[PDB]
């Protein structure tokens, strides 16, 4: 059975004004581990992986 | 015994004039295999050698 009431539904978060800002610190939420747009080519990454393996 | 004569001594090569040039093609005489003034440091070369070994 699906229920209705304050103790079931979520309070809907109001859309921010064009002047209002969400106030969310992105470093507290994530930390990047691989950028997808690199100066490197597939070959070079592949090559590096071989090297990382050899070491 | 040490000998004297045309068949023993070398013909002495005359000193070149300030205008004269020796005319010697250096590529026919040598080909370089390691420059001693590199943008690299001992550490990096050492490191590369380890890598060359691992591969």
Curated annotation (Swiss-Prot), chains A, B:
Post-translational modification (record): Phosphorylation by CSNK1G2/CK1 triggered by estrogen enhances corepression of estrogen receptor (ER). Acetylation is essential for its transcriptional coactivator activity.
Subcellular location: Nucleus
Reported tissue expression: Widely expressed. High expression in brain, liver, kidney, and cardiac muscle, ovaries, adrenal glands and virgin mammary glands. Higher in tumors than in adjacent normal tissue from the same individual. Up-regulated in a wide variety of cancers including breast, liver, ovarian, and colorectal cancer and its expression levels are closely correlated with tumor aggressiveness and metastasis.
Cross-link (Glycyl lysine isopeptide (Lys-Gly) (interchain with G-Cter in ubiquitin)): 17
Cysteines joined through disulfide linkages: none
Sequence similarity: Belongs to the metastasis-associated protein family.
Functional description taken from the UniProt entry: Transcriptional coregulator which can act as both a transcriptional corepressor and coactivator. Acts as a component of the histone deacetylase NuRD complex which participates in the remodeling of chromatin. In the NuRD complex, regulates transcription of its targets by modifying the acetylation status of the target chromatin and cofactor accessibility to the target DNA. In conjunction with other components of NuRD, acts as a transcriptional corepressor of BRCA1, ESR1, TFF1 and CDKN1A. Acts as a transcriptional coactivator of BCAS3, and SUMO2, independent of the NuRD complex.
Associated pathology: Involved in the epigenetic regulation of ESR1 expression in breast cancer in a TFAP2C, IFI16 and HDAC4/5/6-dependent manner.
Annotated domain remarks: Isoform Short contains a Leu-Arg-Ile-Leu-Leu motif (ER binding motif).
Subunit relationships: Component of the nucleosome remodeling and deacetylase (NuRD) repressor complex, composed of core proteins MTA1, MTA2, MTA3, RBBP4, RBBP7, HDAC1, HDAC2, MBD2, MBD3, and peripherally associated proteins CDK2AP1, CDK2AP2, GATAD2A, GATAD2B, CHD3, CHD4 and CHD5. The exact stoichiometry of the NuRD complex is unknown, and some subunits such as MBD2 and MBD3, GATAD2A and GATAD2B, and CHD3, CHD4 and CHD5 define mutually exclusive NuRD complexes. Interacts with RBBP4; the interaction is direct. Interacts with BMAL1. Interacts with CLOCK. Interacts with COP1. Interacts with CSNK1G2 in the cytoplasm.
Name by which UniProt lists this protein: Metastasis-associated protein MTA1
Biological source species: Homo sapiens (Human)
Record gene name: MTA1
């Amino acid at each position: 059975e699906i229920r209705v009431g304050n103790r079931y539904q979520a309070d809907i978060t109001d859309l921010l004004k064009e002047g209002e800002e969400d106030g969310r610190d992105q470093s507290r939420l994530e930390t990047q581990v691989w950028e997808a747009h690199n100066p490197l080519t597939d070959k070079q990454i592949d090559q590096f992986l071989v090297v990382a393996r050899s070491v």
